[PDB]
């Protein structure tokens, strides 16, 4: 069900950007790296790992 | 024993891979004459040794001659790429094992290929200077001849004598246009004469520490010519201000562009004297050293401008003088592009955010059967979000823009074949109120955008003022400052978007200069270019109808140019602008025309770019955010096409061909562009027609579709798929993978893709009509991903849904049902939306029916 | 009415950038040449003393701008230094050890010596 | 975005938060680190 995982990752990145976390650089760089790699998902479990690692 | 060649006899006049150190021959009078000429001309240090023993042999010849080099560059095939590889390896750029980098050939992936290529510029400049030696040896031995390329190995020492006729000494002129023109635009890829930036002009030495003031290089550039192009039988004007009207500028900017390298980048760009406006020593720009144009001294000059009004304030503020000079010097090690300074004393960054997702749409999809485990319609497109280093990482890409020449005796056909392709149009230097303002609230340039958009200025400058500015442009020059921001919109890839809002002034002049031609292309139908056409009402249908007016077997096919708005080469971007102006020769002085061309080639091909705060120099490309950009690269598209057709004709042995009309079309088109100089209206008209026959083109804003006889291309006559790429490579500095270009072989179905659309064949009214439909996933993604603010009033979102449904209505008729349910859900969606509040009722299938059947007449 | 405001802002920005530069070393260069035609890609290279360098990572902070330095055939003693997050940095941190802990683009604010 | 938790319910209905479960596991072995380990560990 990659559809729900992509949508959830998008709304999570949205609330993250809303949280005003743009202070640091490498944190947001890796964050958007995960986001760009979960919006392009071929497997649902890979998206699962990226999503759970990004949630924290 | 197959190589490249150049031939123009009475009948076969071609440039193709024709089939034919101590190369032995197999004639008596001819090799006798060869021996005699070799005995007359041998004491020049540019001639390969010969041997009269009927064998007229050579010696010390690179296995691949200069010809094959120029060819292999001109016709590159990632499939068949033996020659370019072998050359780049044998001559110390990298070893054969360098041929494993995925995308090694590319210019975006593996930009090391730039260095790999420049590893031969010395081998080039050597043969160049040898060639000039040979030209002088000929003129001072008194022989009339011709200068091809299959007769000079990669070292440079020419050979292959026995074709000319003994004249009397001191009186001899050779035909050179073939040589320097074919060989023209590679002296830039390898960056040939770069060695001449050193003290003895040698790498094993420091750079010439040029005075930090030397600007003109006029004498130096003429040294460059009298040393390299002393035999270009046309009055090269160091500054093309002295070239007569138009065909001479294309001939001469094509030389400043080459000599622009040997000189420091600290020397080009504007020229700032110091004007003492009521004493104040304003260091404003009163000149410009363009890389491709020359030392344009602004004729009009005004000291002691005691008072000031709108015109001169704008004229000067547009300059980079008062920013570059009077600004805290800025360095930036991120990029490779040259930098200048910074307005404010702190570098800046901008990060992009992700677009909002529409939940209700997703619910509708999951409930009505979409978004299921294996639906044929999945999601691929979203509103991405970018990180910190975005604007600058956006800017960096320009490193693909190598400055290149373009073969000038070949390009001395196409400017005018395109003149024909626009002949049926209007065109003139119209006045101010003759310019209907389109796209008002678009943008403005660095100083300007801080104060508004183009609308406030078009509200400011009264008519007479813009005409004063136009006259200025006819006799002055002004450079400008773009501002490359980032754009936020849905897509599938993970790169970033780039909007480039050029100055207000470049607009408020180019409009006055082109609006008539614009409108005249925005109101034709059945034309070749199709910008501004209607969108519905058999629109696509009648369009296709035109496209196959009288074609043989329609194997219709389209394409795309890799990164067009950045890798846009140099001489072609000028040709396009010059063709865009021959609609003035009843109103503008050829001087006005040159200075107008200069204003453009300053405000577009290279100017100032505020990249956050880091003012770099745009080394080329094309301003995406420019009005004339669309029709401009449409001209460029036709140019690329027309060229492809030229290279096709010449890339095909007429001997083996049995047809006879196009044969003596090709031979005389050779005679047209490479052997003579004057425009020959007969042949440009005939060839333009012949193109309108067998290669009907549909050209939208930088977007292309073509319909072409397939039989001709089986034997090779018109633009195939591979030739149009082999040319794109060596003239555009990008690479178009054949996998990214398609070919529909049965007109029963539409084009696989044009304007991002596929087309089907239905029976509306029991009629075989052609309807184009979008990608369903694209419409889906566009659905549940909202770009702008819509939560306040969904009006714009409602209209977005409407437009989606109008694109989707050609799915209702699509075979696959799920596709139709896409439209169905969109419909019911809009139904609920309007409920919350027939032909005005867009929540009825008949509205969407009206706007596609190919006979309706309404709004 | 706003047309007057924006046309005014043009030359206002002009004259104030002039004042922000206005000097005589500029005048010292203008007389060293002809009627004045001189490339604009050299003026701030000479008549400016507020060089700003954006250093991306470590491996260039070693082959390039360091802790005074010379560039543009001049001398530059490094003044206050700031990282990509607009925060102050001390020079001892720039080494292979603590490098992965700083906002990378290191903007310097050197002066001419 | 309050619906984030709403979609995270259905997410957890088929995920069991594999990495969060691994972290709670590492916490269950009595090896609770000084800080959360990037997705130190003492004893
Ligand atoms: C005008 C503008 C100026 C910007 C500037 C100035 C001050 C120079 C920045 O300095 C800058 O950094 C920007 C970047 O964020 C920046 C920018 O994004 C825009 C912009 C925006 C936001 C929306 C637009 C829309 C929306 C309603 C969707 C259009 O429909 C549209 O047509 C546009 C074009 O005309 C259009 C547009 O140009
Ligand atoms: C909705 C619409 C319907 C049209 C229809 C209907 C009745 C099917 C035609 O039949 C028709 O012929 C049209 C002409 O092309 C036509 C049309 O142009 C638009 C439209 C356009 C082109 C641009 C818009 C832009 C741009 C400047 C990007 C906005 O920024 C914006 O906000 C808009 C919303 O209000 C907005 C807009 O509505």
Q: What is the DSSP string of B604-672?
A: TTS-EEEETTEEEE--S---TT-HHHHHHHHHHHHHHHHHHHHHHHHTS-TTT----TTHHHHHHHHII
Q: How far apart are CA C23 and CA C32, in angstroms?
A: 15
Contact yes or no for B742/B752 (Cβ under 8 A): yes
B757 bridge partner residues: B754
Q: How far apart are CA B601 and CA B628, in angstroms?
A: 13
Number of H helices, E strands in chain B: 30, 22
Contact yes or no for B354/A38 (Cβ under 8 A): no
**C in contact with A (at least 3 C-beta pairs within 8 A):** yes
Q: What is the DSSP string of B819-851?
A: HHHHHHHHHHHHHHHHHH---S-SSSHHHHHHT
> What domain range includes position B788?
758-850
Q: What is the DSSP string of B481-545?
A: EE-EEEE---BSSSS-EEEE---HHHHHHHHHHHHHHHHHHSS--S-SB-TT--SSSSHHHHHHH
- In the residue annotation, B702 being an active-site residue is answered as yes
Which residues 6+ apart lie within 8 Å of B799 measured at CB?
none
Q: How far apart are CA B600 and CA B598, in angstroms?
A: 5
Q: Is residue B350 in a domain?
A: no
Contact yes or no for B530/B583 (Cβ under 8 A): no
Nearest ligand, CA B804: 2
Sign of CA dihedral C93, C97, C98, C99: positive
Q: How far apart are CA B327 and CA B347, in angstroms?
A: 14
Annotation-wise, does B755 bind a ligand? no
Nearest ligand, CA B386: 1
Which residues 6+ apart lie within 8 Å of B24 measured at CB?
B55, B57
Q: What is the DSSP string of B30-74?
A: HHHHHHHHHHHS--STTB---B-----B--S--SSBHHHHHHHHH
Coil vs helix vs strand at B702:
coil
∠ Cα B813 B818 B821 (to 5°)? 70
Calculate how close chain B gets to C97, using CA atoms only, in Å: 22
B200 lines ligand 1 (CB under 6 A): no
Cβ <8 Å between A8 and D15: no
B354: DSSP letter: P
Would an 8 Å CB–CB cutoff place A56 in contact with chain D?
A: yes
Coil vs helix vs strand at B758:
strand
Coil vs helix vs strand at B274:
coil
Q: Is residue B14 in a domain?
A: yes
Would an 8 Å CB–CB cutoff place A12 in contact with chain D?
A: yes
- What region does B756 belong to: left with phi over 0, alpha with psi -120 to 50, or beta? left
Q: Is B155 exposed, middle or buried (0-12, 13-18, 19+ CB in 10 A)?
A: middle
B64 token code pair: 């691949």
Q: What is the DSSP string of chain C?
A: -HHHHHHHHHHHHHHHHHHHH--SHHHHHHTTSSSS-EETTSHHHHH----B-EE-SHHHHHHSS---B--SSS-EE---EE-TTS-EE-GGG-STTTGGGS-S-EEE--EE-
Q: How far apart are CA B648 and CA B646, in angstroms?
A: 5
What is the residue with the minimal CA distance to atom 16 of ligand 1?
B485
Q: Is residue B729 in a domain?
A: no
Q: Is residue C20 in a domain?
A: no
Question: What is the CATH number for C74?
Answer: 3.30.70.3540
Coil vs helix vs strand at A52:
helix
B2 token code pair: 């197959």
- In the residue annotation, B407 being an active-site residue is answered as no
Domain boundary residue, one of B135, B155, B186: B186
B482 lines ligand 1 (CB under 6 A): no
Q: Is B122 exposed, middle or buried (0-12, 13-18, 19+ CB in 10 A)?
A: middle
Nearest alpha carbon to residue B443 among B628, B311, B625, B632: B625
Q: Which is it for strands B608-611 and B481-482: parallel, antiparallel or unpaired? A: parallel
Q: How far apart are CA B503 and CA B506, in angstroms?
A: 6
Q: How far apart are CA A41 and CA A38, in angstroms?
A: 5
Q: What is the DSSP string of B549-561?
A: SS-SSB--EE---
Q: Is residue C75 in a domain?
A: yes
B830 C-alpha to center of ligand 2: Å? 17
B796 lines ligand 2 (CB under 6 A): yes
Q: How far apart are CA B617 and CA B398, in angstroms?
A: 10
In what order do the strands lie in the sheet containing B295-297? B295-297, B285-289, B269-272, C38-39
B111 token code pair: 């930009």
SS3 per-residue string spanning B306-349: CCCCHHHHHHHHCCCHHHHCCCEEECCCCCCCCECEECCCCCCC
> What domain range includes position C40?
25-113
HSE-up of residue B49 (Cα within 13 Å, Cβ side): 6
Coil vs helix vs strand at D10:
helix
Q: Is residue C59 in a domain?
A: yes
Q: How far apart are CA B545 and CA B578, in angstroms?
A: 32
Which residues 6+ apart lie within 8 Å of B149 measured at CB?
B4, B6, B65, B66, B67, B70, B178, B179, B182, B183
Catalytic residue (one of B305, B393, B520, B701) = B701
Q: Is residue B465 in a domain?
A: no
Cβ <8 Å between B362 and A25: no
Q: Is residue C73 in a domain?
A: yes
The pick from B803, B804, B840 for probing ligand 2's pocket by mutation, whose C-beta has the most ligand atoms within 8 angstroms, reads B803
Nearest alpha carbon to residue C110 among C73, C81, C90: C81
B565 token code pair: 């708005």
C48 token code pair: 């400016």
B340 token code pair: 């200048």
Which residues 6+ apart lie within 8 Å of A10 measured at CB?
A35, A39, B354, B357, B382, B383
In what order do the strands lie in the sheet containing C106-108? C54-55, C106-108, C81-82, C88-89
Q: How far apart are CA B475 and CA B471, in angstroms?
A: 6
Calculate how close chain A gets to D42, using CA atoms only, in Å: 21
Q: How far apart are CA B174 and CA B577, in angstroms?
A: 33
Helices (H), A1-56: 2-18, 26-39, 44-55
Domain boundary residue, one of B123, B157, B186: B186
Q: How far apart are CA B312 and CA B307, in angstroms?
A: 10
The technique is: cryo-EM
B760 bridge partner residues: B771
Nearest alpha carbon to residue B52 among B72, B75, B27: B27
Number of H helices, E strands in chain D: 2, 0
Domain count, chain C: 1
Catalytic residue (one of B153, B246, B332, B703) = B703
Which residues 6+ apart lie within 8 Å of B12 measured at CB?
B653, B654, B655, B667
B589 token code pair: 């002085």
Cβ <8 Å between B354 and A14: yes
Would an 8 Å CB–CB cutoff place A53 in contact with chain C?
A: no
Which residues 6+ apart lie within 8 Å of B522 measured at CB?
B531, B532
B128 token code pair: 């160049």
Q: What are the chain A neighbours of D39 within 8 Å (beta carbons)?
A: 52-53, 56
How far CA C5 is from CA of B284, B310, B456, B503, B746, in Å, comes to 22, 10, 10, 18, 62
- In the residue annotation, B703 being an active-site residue is answered as yes
B793 token code pair: 């009033």
Coil vs helix vs strand at B466:
helix
Domain count, chain B: 2
Q: Is residue B775 in a domain?
A: yes
């Amino acid at each position: 069900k990659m559809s729900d995982v992509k949508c959830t990752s998008v709304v999570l990145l949205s609330v993250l950007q809303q949280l005003r976390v743009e202070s640091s650089s490498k944190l947001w760089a890796q964050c958007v790296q995960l986001h760009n790699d979960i919006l392009l998902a071929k497997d649902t479990t890979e998206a699962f790992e990226k999503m759970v690692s990004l949630l924290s | 024993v197959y190589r490249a060649f150049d031939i123009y006899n009475d009948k076969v006049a071609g440039f193709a891979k024709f089939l034919k150190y101590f190369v032995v021959k197999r004639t008596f009078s001819n090799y006798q004459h060869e021996e005699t000429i070799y005995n007359l001309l041998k004491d020049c240090p540019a001639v390969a040794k010969h041997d009269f023993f009927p064998h007229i042999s050579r010696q010390r010849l690179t296995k691949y001659t200069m010809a094959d080099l120029v060819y292999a560059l001109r016709h590159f095939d990632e499939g068949n790429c033996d020659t370019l590889k072998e050359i780049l390896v044998t001559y110390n750029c990298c070893d054969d094992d360098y041929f494993n980098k995925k995308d090694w050939y590319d210019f975006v992936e593996n930009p090391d290929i730039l260095r790999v290529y420049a590893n031969l510029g010395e081998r080039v400049r050597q043969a160049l200077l040898k060639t000039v030696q040979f030209c002088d040896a000929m003129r001072n031995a008194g022989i009339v001849g011709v200068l091809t390329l299959d007769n000079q190995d990669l070292n440079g020492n020419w050979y292959d004598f026995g074709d000319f006729i003994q004249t009397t000494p001191g009186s001899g002129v050779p035909v050179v246009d073939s040589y320097y023109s074919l060989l023209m635009p590679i002296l830039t890829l390898t960056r040939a004469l770069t060695a001449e930036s050193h003290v003895d002009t040698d790498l094993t030495k420091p750079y010439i520490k040029w005075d930090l003031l030397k600007y003109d290089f006029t004498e130096e550039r003429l040294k460059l010519f009298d040393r390299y192009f002393k035999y270009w039988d046309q009055t090269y004007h160091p500054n093309c201000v002295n070239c007569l009207d138009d065909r001479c500028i294309l001939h001469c900017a094509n030389f400043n562009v080459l000599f622009s390298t040997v000189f420091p980048p600290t020397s080009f760009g504007p020229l700032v004297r110091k004007i003492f406006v009521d004493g104040v020593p304003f260091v404003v720009s009163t000149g410009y050293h363009f890389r491709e144009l020359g030392v344009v001294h602004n004729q009009d000059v005004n000291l002691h401008s005691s008072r000031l009004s709108f015109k001169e304030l704008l004229v000067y503020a547009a300059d980079p003088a008062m920013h570059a000079a009077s600004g805290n010097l800025l360095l930036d090690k991120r990029t490779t592009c040259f930098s200048v300074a910074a307005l404010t004393n702190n570098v800046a960054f901008q990060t992009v955010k992700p677009g909002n997702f529409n939940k209700d749409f997703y619910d509708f999809a999951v409930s009505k059967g979409f978004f299921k485990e294996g639906s044929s319609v999945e999601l691929k497109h979203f509103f991405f979000a970018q990180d910190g280093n975005a604007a600058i990482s956006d800017y960096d890409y320009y490193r693909y823009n190598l400055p290149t020449m373009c073969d000038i005796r070949q390009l001395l056909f196409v400017v005018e074949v395109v003149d024909k392709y626009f002949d049926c149009y209007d065109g003139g230097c119209i006045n101010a109120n003759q310019v209907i303002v389109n796209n008002l609230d678009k943008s403005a340039g660095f100083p300007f955008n801080k104060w508004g958009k183009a609308r406030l200025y078009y509200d400011s400058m009264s008519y007479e003022d813009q005409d004063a500015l136009f006259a200025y442009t006819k006799r002055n020059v002004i450079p400008t400052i773009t501002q490359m921001n980032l754009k936020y919109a849905i897509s599938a890839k993970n790169r970033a978007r780039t909007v480039a809002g050029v100055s207000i002034c470049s607009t408020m002049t180019n409009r006055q200069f082109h609006q008539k031609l614009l409108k005249s292309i925005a109101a034709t139908r059945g034309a070749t270019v199709v910008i501004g056409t209607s969108k519905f009402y058999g629109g696509w249908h009648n369009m296709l109808k035109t496209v196959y007016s009288d074609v043989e077997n329609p194997h219709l096919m389209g394409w795309d140019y890799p990164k067009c708005d950045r890798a846009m080469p140099n001489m072609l971007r000028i040709m396009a602008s010059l063709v865009l102006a021959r609609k003035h020769t009843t109103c503008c002085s050829l001087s006005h025309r040159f200075y107008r061309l200069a204003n453009e080639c300053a405000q577009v091909l290279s100017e100032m770019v505020m990249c956050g705060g880091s003012l770099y120099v745009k080394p080329g490309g094309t301003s995406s955010g420019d009005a004339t950009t669309a029709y401009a690269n449409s001209v460029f598209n036709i140019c690329q096409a027309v060229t492809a057709n030229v290279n096709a004709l010449l890339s095909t042995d007429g001997n083996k061909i049995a047809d006879k009309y196009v044969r003596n079309l090709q031979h005389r088109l050779y005679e047209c562009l490479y052997r003579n100089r004057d425009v020959d209206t007969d042949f440009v008209n005939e060839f333009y027609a012949y193109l309108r026959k067998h290669f009907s083109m549909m050209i939208l804003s930088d977007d292309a579709v073509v319909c072409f006889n397939s039989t001709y291309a089986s034997q090779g006559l018109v633009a195939s798929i591979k030739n149009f790429k082999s040319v794109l490579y060596y003239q555009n500095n990008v690479f178009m993978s054949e996998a990214k270009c398609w070919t529909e072989t049965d007109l029963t179905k539409g084009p696989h893709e044009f304007c991002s659309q596929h087309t089907m064949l239905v029976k509306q009214g029991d009629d075989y009509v052609y309807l184009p439909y979008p990608d369903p996933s694209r419409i889906l993604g566009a659905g549940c991903f909202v770009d702008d603010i819509v939560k306040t009033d969904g009006t714009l979102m409602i209209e977005r849904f409407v437009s989606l449904a109008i694109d989707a209505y050609p799915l209702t008729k699509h075979p696959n049902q799920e596709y139709a349910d896409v439209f169905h859900l969109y419909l019911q969606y809009i139904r609920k939306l309007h409920d919350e509040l027939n032909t005005s009722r867009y929540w009825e299938p008949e509205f969407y029916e009206a706007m596609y059947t190919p006979h309706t007449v309404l709004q | 009415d706003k047309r007057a405001k924006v046309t005014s802002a043009m030359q206002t920005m002009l004259f104030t950038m002039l004042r922000k530069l206005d000097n005589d070393a500029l005048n010292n260069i203008i007389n060293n040449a002809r009627d004045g035609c001189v490339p604009l890609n050299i003026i701030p290279l000479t008549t400016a003393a507020k060089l700003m360098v954006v250093i991306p990572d470590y491996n260039t902070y070693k082959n390039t701008c360091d802790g005074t330095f010379t560039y543009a055939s001049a001398l530059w003693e490094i003044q206050q230094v700031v990282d990509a997050d607009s925060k102050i940095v001390q020079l001892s941190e720039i080494s292979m050890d603590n490098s992965p802990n700083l906002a990378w683009p290191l903007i310097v604010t050197a002066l001419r010596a």
